[PDB]
Amino acid sequence: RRLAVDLSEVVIKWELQRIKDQQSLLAKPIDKQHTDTVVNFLIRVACQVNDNTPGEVLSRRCVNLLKTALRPDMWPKSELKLQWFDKLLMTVEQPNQVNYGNICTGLEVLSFLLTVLQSPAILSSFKPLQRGIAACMTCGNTKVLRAVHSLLSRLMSIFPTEPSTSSVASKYEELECLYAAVGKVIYEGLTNYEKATNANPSQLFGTLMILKSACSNNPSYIDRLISVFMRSLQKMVREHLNPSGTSELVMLSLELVKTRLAVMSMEMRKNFIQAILTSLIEKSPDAKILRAVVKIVEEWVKNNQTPTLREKSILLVKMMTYIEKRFPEDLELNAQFLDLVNYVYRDETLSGSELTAKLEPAFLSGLRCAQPLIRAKFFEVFDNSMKRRVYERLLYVTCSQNWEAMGNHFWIKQCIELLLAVCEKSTPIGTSCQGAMLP
């Protein structure tokens, strides 16, 4: 079989040399039907040769050889013979013995063909595949789920799912059945996890990946499923707080609903903001979850598609209490949160708001931060808050600044920093101690 792959590579290298020469019977290109059969043999051998439990290396070589065979110069718009994939992908249905590696290689080849082919050719070629792609979405193998997720992501990026809860699953018949199966499996998975008396979030895994693929180029898609998805998200957060992929599924779900606040009902919106995100901030032990929540809140703040000032205030106050307390060692997370607080205090819209009054402990944490870049940004904000005058700053430190929020910090450091800022900076350095100077 390796020898056969070698012959295919020989034909490809002959066409590379033809391209080099062209950049007359010896210079004329190869007959197209031979290119077609070489491409099709490469596809078939790549999908077949993987072992059920080595041929994996020959598969990878065939895949690379196919990726070189289909280029803007080598053999674009070759024919393809995809019908045989229908039999292969249906094997996923059979749980006795199935070559999962073959399924993964075929799905990868399909996603590559989606980058290779022209759009009408994509639509024409993929129609029989729809049953096979739909079959993959059911199996419990995580590798196949990820492969089909990537394939569907690329396909739906080329052709986005229908909005508005339109009755047709797609405007394209070649996508209609596949997209109907995608929607049905999403709905059934969410409903099953809602119904389940006791189940791991891992049951959601494939459902969540497929849903993410369906929403990749159509954020509105989850508006169909918003109630059932929100109840599943509540169940996920509850299972996470009171117990490794759980974090990944919670982050994925949060990324899905982060921009659909206007669709959710008032009770669901309130639960999401003051129940889910707040309990993640307060209870959740995973710092990656905290980083994701802080990123979501930062995107909200920096932007009815965004939360009200009260919800932003609630989230920022919860973060200001919990993030420093629960994760003192995480310098990156605290840096991210203090960067957000710095943006808030720099923002002109929020200046003088109740929020800036509520975030004063966070600002004072920024002034006393052990990370010099944060401390400098906070002092730069602090410096401009008052006039460059000795008397006014002495009055500030005596009268205006409640220093209680500094805690055990020796806040005399901030007084020194504030008053020395008044000094002239551009004057050449010098002394009154002329008797001590080196002549």
């Binding site: 009054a357 808050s385 008052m386 500030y396 009268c399 205006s400 600044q401």
Partner: peptide, 11 residues
Amino acid sequence: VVPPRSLFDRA
């Protein structure tokens, strides 16, 4: 004597 305004005074 009027204290200077701070970033935390609710204007």
